[PDB]
């Protein structure tokens, strides 16, 4: 479509040449659907998550849709993987899940790839 990645971070307003929160250059990651951008550290991503989100069509929090069913319904039930940031409805998982776990939860794609 008409998507162009924004050249500034939604959080600190810096470009890739200078994260204004850290005072260091830092690449931006940009939502595949709406083009909003953020520095990974401004998005509070780990370094491994930073690498992961650059390998697929990452979506920002607002655009995130479930990998399994494709909808953006039920924000309260859309888990974000703590290794790759993909979204999965707890009711789209099998076995479905009743409550967000405590501490990290990671998706089946990451379980297949990393373990």
């Amino acid at each position: 479509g008409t998507v162009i990645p924004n050249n500034y971070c939604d959080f600190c307003l810096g470009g890739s040449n200078m994260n204004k929160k850290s005072g260091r250059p830092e690449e931006l990651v940009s939502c595949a659907d709406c083009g909003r951008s953020g520095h990974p550290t401004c998005l509070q991503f780990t370094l491994n998550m930073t690498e992961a989100v650059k390998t697929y069509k990452w979506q920002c929090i607002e655009c995130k849709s479930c990998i399994l069913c494709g909808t953006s319904e039920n924000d309260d039930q859309l888990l974000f993987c703590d290794d790759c940031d993909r979204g999965y409805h707890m009711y789209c998982l099998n076995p479905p899940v009743a409550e967000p776990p405590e501490g990290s939860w990671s998706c089946h794609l990451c379980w297949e790839l990393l373990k």
């Binding site: 959080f11 600190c12 909003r36 929090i61 859309l78 888990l79 974000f80 703590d82």
Partner: peptide
């Protein structure tokens, strides 16, 4: 674990 809802609430600095 994070959901969209909890992630929204903990990332308030997002434009």
């Amino acid at each position: 674990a994070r959901t969209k809802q909890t992630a929204r609430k903990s990332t308030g600095g997002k434009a």
